[PDB]
């Protein structure tokens, strides 16, 4: 039940999503090992992901969380990179999309820095890079990220050396 709607680059919604993508690039402590060496992106396409069932699943949970947290979902817009982006947009997020070995335990991880999520497009640690050239810093191959609506509710604060 998923359809993808292309946004025009002239659309304010395209422009605000692109700005969040570009403005949240940073340098990484691996010198580019996982995600590649870059300061900015060439945005090729932004598509709205439309699925009524998956949206209703989200809003149902959001209401449960809000009701447990003084009517505050604590909703953010956050990046997600994953080899399973196609599965996610069709079937929704679930336990198969978790980072089992993540530093905060087995769960689904999101980033404020788009460049952090870029490190996971080809797998944990960038895996072996793009399927065509085996290059984690490939400048040719098309990558995909998700910009996601995320309910945090009451969030446990972990101070961490990163």
């Amino acid at each position: 039940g998923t359809i993808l709607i292309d946004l025009s680059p002239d659309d304010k919604e395209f422009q605000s999503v692109e700005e969040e993508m570009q403005s949240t690039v940073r340098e990484h402590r691996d010198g580019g090992h996982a995600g590649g060496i870059f300061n900015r992106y060439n945005i090729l396409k932004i598509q709205k992901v439309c699925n009524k069932k998956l949206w209703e699943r989200y809003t149902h949970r959001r209401k449960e969380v809000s009701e447990e947290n003084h009517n505050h979902a604590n909703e953010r817009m956050l990046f997600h990179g994953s080899p399973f982006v196609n599965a996610i947009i069709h079937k929704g997020f679930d336990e198969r999309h978790a980072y089992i070995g993540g530093m905060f335990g087995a769960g689904i991880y999101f980033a404020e820095n788009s460049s952090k999520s870029n490190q996971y497009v080809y797998g944990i640690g960038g895996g072996t890079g793009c399927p065509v050239h085996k290059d984690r810093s490939c400048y040719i191959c098309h990558r995909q990220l998700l910009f996601c609506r995320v309910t945090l509710g009451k969030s446990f604060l972990q101070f961490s050396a990163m």
Binding site: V17, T24, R26, F38, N39, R40, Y41, I43, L44, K45, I46, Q47, K48, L54, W55, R57, Y58, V65, E68, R76, L78, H80, I88, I89, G92, F93, M103, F104, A106, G107, I108, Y109, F110, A111, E112, N113, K116, C138, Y139, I140, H142, R143, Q144, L145, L146, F147, C148, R149, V150, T151, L152, G153, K154, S155, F156, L157, Q158, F159, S160, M162
Partner: protein, 47 residues
Amino acid sequence: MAHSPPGHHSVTGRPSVNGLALAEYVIYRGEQAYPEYLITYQIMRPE
């Protein structure tokens, strides 16, 4: 998947060393995220 810490719905990873890094977050229920936008891109080689 693990559970959220008792009395919490997510974890926030606050950076404590790299002053330029932004936060990272973890949820333990897939229903707590919706994949709004699919962005197709290339990384650009620095000039």
